[PDB]
C-alpha cells in the first residue's frame, strides 16, 4: 500500500509491525478513517491546551446555574472534573451530530475524512495532495503532543 | 423557484441573489410561506416603530401621569401597563390585529384555526398587502418590487436594531447611544 497520503519526507511506509497482513484493504480504510479522526481531534485538543495559557481563559461563566466560571475551571485533565457534566453531555451531543449527521460507513466519503467541510480546500490534485498530507502529518504530530500533554498534566500535577 | 418567488432574497451585489435560508424553512413549508412572510413583515414594521419609539422619547416626551412617560425605555413597560396606557395601546393593536390579520388570514374569523383551518386568505401575492397607502407605490412592477425589497430590508434591520437596542439598554441604560 503506497501513494495513500501517508509517506512523507523524513519517513516512508513506517510499519515496524503495522498493517500486519500487508493487505486487507477494508482494515486499512477503517484505519485511515481512524487515524484522520484521531489526528483532527488531537490537533483540536493541543490547540485547546495552548489557547487558554497563551490567551486567557474565556470571560464568561460556562454555568450560570452552578455558578462555575471559565476563569475558575483549571486547564488540563483537571477540567474534566470541573466542567459541569451537563456540559460534557452537550459536548457528546455535538460529537453525535458531528458523527451521525453524515454517514461514514466503509466506502462512503465519510470513511475517508470527507465530511464536506472544505473551507481550507484547494483546487489542483497536487495541491489537494499537499493540503491532505499537511493535515495528516499535523494530526500525527498532534496525537503525539496531545498524549504527551496528557502525561505532563497527569504527572506534574498541573497544565505544565 | 426559491421561496415561491417571494421578494426579499435579492442580494446587494448583482443578479447573484442571497436567498438566505440555511435551515431551509422555505422549501420545507412552501404552503406555510405566506404566513412566514406575513410574520416577517409584521415583525419588521413593529420593530421599525419600536426602534423609533426607543429613540424619540430620549428627546421629547408627552406629558402624562409622570410614572410611565417620565421613565427610561427598559423600565417604561411595567409602569405603562400599570398606568393604563399600554392597556389602551393593547386594545388598539388588538382590534387592528384581530380585524386585519385575523380576517385576511382566517376565512372564518369567528372561529379559531383549529376549527376553521383553511388560512387560504393569505396568498403569496397579498402577503404584506393591507391596501394601506397603495397610491404611493410607483406605477411600474420593477419599482414596486424594489420598494417591497426596501421595506423588507429595513424591517429586518429594524428587528436586529431593536433587539440590540433593548439588550444594550437593559445592560447599561443611557439614551439613544446605548453604549456603556
Amino acid at each position: 500500500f503506497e501513494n495513500e497520503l501517508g509517506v512523507q519526507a523524513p519517513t516512508g511506509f513506517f510499519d515496524p509491525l503495522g498493517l500486519s497482513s500487508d493487505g486487507s484493504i477494508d482494515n486499512f480504510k477503517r484505519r485511515r478513517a481512524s487515524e484522520i479522526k484521531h489526528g483532527r481531534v488531537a490537533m483540536l485538543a493541543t490547540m485547546g491546551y495552548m489557547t487558554p495559557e497563551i490567551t486567557g481563559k474565556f470571560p464568561g461563566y460556562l454555568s450560570y446555574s452552578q455558578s462555575i466560571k471559565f476563569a475558575d475551571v483549571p486547564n488540563g485533565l483537571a477540567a474534566m472534573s470541573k466542567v459541569p457534566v451537563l456540559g460534557w453531555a452537550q459536548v457528546a451531543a455535538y460529537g453525535a451530530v458531528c458523527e451521525l449527521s453524515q454517514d461514514q460507513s466503509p466506502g462512503t466519503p465519510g470513511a475517508a475524512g470527507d465530511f464536506g467541510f472544505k473551507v481550507i480546500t484547494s483546487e489542483d490534485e497536487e495541491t489537494l495532495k499537499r493540503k491532505l498530507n499537511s493535515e495528516l502529518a499535523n494530526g500525527r504530530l498532534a496525537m503525539m503532543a496531545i498524549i504527551g500533554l496528557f502525561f505532563q498534566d497527569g504527572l506534574t500535577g498541573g497544565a505544565y | 423557484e426559491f421561496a415561491g418567488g417571494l421578494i426579499g432574497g435579492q442580494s446587494a451585489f448583482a443578479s447573484q441573489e442571497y436567498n438566505f435560508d440555511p435551515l431551509g424553512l422555505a422549501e420545507k413549508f412552501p404552503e406555510q410561506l405566506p404566513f412566514f412572510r406575513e410574520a416577517e413583515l409584521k415583525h419588521g414594521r413593529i420593530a421599525m416603530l419600536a426602534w423609533v419609539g426607543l429613540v424619540v422619547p430620549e428627546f421629547v416626551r408627552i406629558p402624562g401621569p409622570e410614572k410611565c412617560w417620565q421613565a427610561s425605555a427598559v423600565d417604561a413597560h411595567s409602569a405603562c401597563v400599570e398606568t393604563g396606557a399600554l392597556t389602551q395601546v393593547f386594545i388598539f393593536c388588538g382590534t387592528l390585529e384581530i380585524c386585519g390579520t385575523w380576517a385576511k388570514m382566517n376565512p372564518m374569523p369567528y372561529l379559531p384555526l383549529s376549527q376553521s383551518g383553511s388560512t387560504g386568505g393569505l396568498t403569496m401575492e397579498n402577503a404584506g398587502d393591507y391596501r394601506l397607502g397603495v397610491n404611493f407605490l410607483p406605477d411600474e412592477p420593477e419599482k414596486v418590487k424594489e420598494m417591497k425589497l426596501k421595506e423588507l430590508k429595513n424591517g429586518r434591520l429594524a428587528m436586529l436594531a431593536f433587539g440590540g437596542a433593548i439588550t444594550q439598554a437593559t445592560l447599561t441604560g443611557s439614551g439613544f447611544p446605548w453604549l456603556y
Binding site: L86, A93, A96, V97, L100, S101 | K28, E31, Q32
Partner: protein, 132 residues
C-alpha cells in the same frame, strides 16, 4: 345453450369482481369516497400496495429530512428529560411551591417537549424508511 347453474354463478362472480374493481375509480361518486371520509386525500397516498406508510402521513412536515427529524427528536428528548428531572427530583418545583415561590417556567416548558420527541422520532423513522 342450456346455461349451467355453475355458469350463472360464474356470471355472478364476474359481475361482483367487475363492480368491485369499477366502483373504486372516479366513476361511482358516492359520499363515502369524498375527501376526509374513506379515500386517501388526493395527492397524498398514505400507503401503497404494501402497507408501508409514505411521507404523506406526516402532514405539514412531510418533507423534513430524516436527519433533521432525528436531531429534533433527540434535542426534544434531552430537553424534556432535563425539564422532567429538574421538576420532579432535582430542585423539585412542588417543594418550591411549598416554599411560597412560583414555579420555574423553564422546567415546565422543557418538560412539555417529551411527547414532541415521541411523535418526532416516530416521524423520523417514517422519513428514514421512505428515503427522505
Amino acid at each position: 345453450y342450456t346455461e349451467s347453474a355453475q355458469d350463472a354463478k360464474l356470471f355472478e362472480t364476474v359481475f361482483s369482481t367487475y363492480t368491485a374493481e369499477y366502483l373504486k375509480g372516479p366513476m361511482y361518486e358516492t359520499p363515502e369516497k369524498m375527501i376526509g371520509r374513506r379515500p386517501f386525500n388526493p395527492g397524498e397516498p398514505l400507503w401503497g400496495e404494501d402497507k408501508k406508510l409514505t411521507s404523506n402521513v406526516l402532514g405539514p412536515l412531510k418533507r423534513v429530512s430524516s436527519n433533521e427529524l432525528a436531531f429534533l427528536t433527540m434535542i426534544c428528548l434531552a430537553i424534556g428529560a432535563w425539564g422532567e428531572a429538574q421538576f420532579l427530583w432535582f430542585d423539585p418545583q412542588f417543594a418550591a411551591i411549598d416554599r411560597g415561590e412560583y414555579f420555574n417556567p423553564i422546567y415546565i416548558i422543557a418538560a412539555s417537549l417529551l411527547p414532541v420527541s415521541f411523535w418526532a422520532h416516530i416521524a423520523c423513522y417514517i422519513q428514514k424508511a421512505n428515503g427522505k
